[PDB]
Design a protein around this ligand. Structure first.
Ligand SMILES: Nc1ncnc2c1ncn2[C@@H]1O[C@H](CSCC[C@H](N)C(=O)O)[C@@H](O)[C@H]1O
Lengths: 265, 265
């Protein structure tokens, strides 16, 4: 009679919380989705071994189209867990699943875990200064989405930082790199010419948040556009005007050039 | 000879990640601070029992003035951990402590935990739509803080959600409620006359996120201002323009007035 939405956290199988792990272990059935994002530092097998339960993976169609036929039925007579990378309900589509549960007569609870949305605190940038967030999507065919460029522009002119989630083709396990993201933004800039993203723009790259050894690098696009930030996943941030304390952390911890202390503060 | 910043999470001792617990258990010395937030579902004793180590609790003065004299000296010959509620680098000034660690020649690592900043996803409001954040601070003497009001205005004008962290006085044992926050905002409104926060404003309250049964309520200020949301900590949110799916969730899960679903596009 209970469905548990449990977050797996940022990177590997140990990023789930003690609460989530223990609840997952006592569940009769465990489902999981790996389409909103992936857990790059581990494998389904390693997660299954930690939880000590078989994990049935569900595709985007399984959930969006058949959540009430695959998950809820069992939840009606058993304790069921639904695992998701990161923190449940950060991904926009998760929320409505709780409504489906309610209508099915199923009780649901949320077990939180770290999300990249909050983990960016490790960049040294103040969390309150982050504005609207956006996702950089790979252009396809004649489709060239550019709304993320506008998000940066609007946040930046208000002195706010912009968190850019990078595209991920979940099925193919293909991650957009921060390099690809910078190349795309420079291309959008050349088209809109809004003076929003250029070779002189300061950016921050966070790779493998959650890992003990994430890559945290800050610098100008001209210098970072071809730098190796390591294995995925990558997150790109275009900060707004910096507080001196943010700048000092970027220089000391993220290898930023001293120049940011006079150009971006 | 390392220093670990480890988050304990939102509500109880089980909100720590397995990774954080594993590492904490093996450290030689374990320190912690409990003034940046409130974990309403546990106690020092339960946390100590979980990690199997004595926890040296530090005050704001101990940390801000003497972190390098109390914690770092030990980190040079031992594995040391510094615990904090939620995520150690969200809505705190602890990031600067990593610079202090560097200066002392001490390598530091960060272990994330569930944060209220991302936990707000449980309100059903799309995370990417949250704009700049702010803190509603208790007025003191003849000083009456009002910066948070201007944040709401700026975000609302862009159709963005505003997360309002509520003040805390750990040593005084004072935890600002959503009610008190609303009372304060109404007073700022009467003063600035911006039409930003009134009795007809729709707001959302999230209390004790992390618990299995947090209090999630949405409605107009006039109806919620004197409602009992339970024990602290509390967080207040002033939504921007709602998507229909957000409204649906607030109505079905947070008990908001069914009328909000009739959005005015
Ligand atoms: N479980 C919880 N429920 C509701 N609000 C919470 C909360 N935990 C923290 N807050 C809110 O955030 C304030 C502390 S700000 C420090 C936040 C912490 N680093 C984190 O990552 O969560 C509190 O005064 C309260 O307004």
């Amino acid at each position: 009679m209970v469905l548990y939405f449990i977050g797996l956290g940022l990177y590997d199988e140990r990023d789930i919380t003690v609460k989530g792990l223990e609840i997952a272990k006592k569940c009769d059935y465990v489902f999981a989705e790996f389409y909103t994002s992936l857990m790059a530092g581990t494998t389904l097998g390693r997660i299954q071994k930690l939880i000590g339960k078989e994990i049935r993976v569900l595709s985007r169609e399984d959930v969006e189209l058949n959540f009430e036929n695959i998950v809820l039925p069992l939840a009606k007579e058993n304790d069921v867990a639904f695992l998701t990378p990161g923190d449940p309900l950060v991904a926009t589509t998760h929320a409505e699943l709780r409504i489906r549960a309610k209508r099915a007569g199923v009780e649901s609870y949320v077990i939180h875990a770290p999300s990249i949305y909050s983990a960016v605190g490790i960049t040294g940038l103040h969390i309150y200064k982050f504005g609207k967030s956006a996702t950089v999507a790979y252009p396809e065919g004649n489709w060239f989405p550019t709304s993320y460029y506008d998000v940066i522009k609007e946040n930046a002119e208000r002195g706010l930082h912009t968190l850019l989630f990078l595209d991920i083709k979940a099925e193919k396990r293909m991650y957009m790199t921060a390099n690809e993201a910078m190349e795309l933004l420079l291309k959008v800039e050349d088209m809109k010419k809004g003076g929003v993203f250029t070779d002189d723009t300061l950016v921050v790259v966070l790779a493998r948040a959650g890992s003990l050894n994430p890559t945290i690098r800050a610098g100008y696009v001209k210098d970072l556009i071809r730098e190796d930030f390591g294995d995925p996943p990558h997150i790109l941030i275009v900060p707004g005007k910096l507080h001196i304390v943010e700048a000092e952390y970027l220089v000391e911890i993220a290898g930023a050039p001293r120049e940011i202390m006079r150009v971006n503060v």
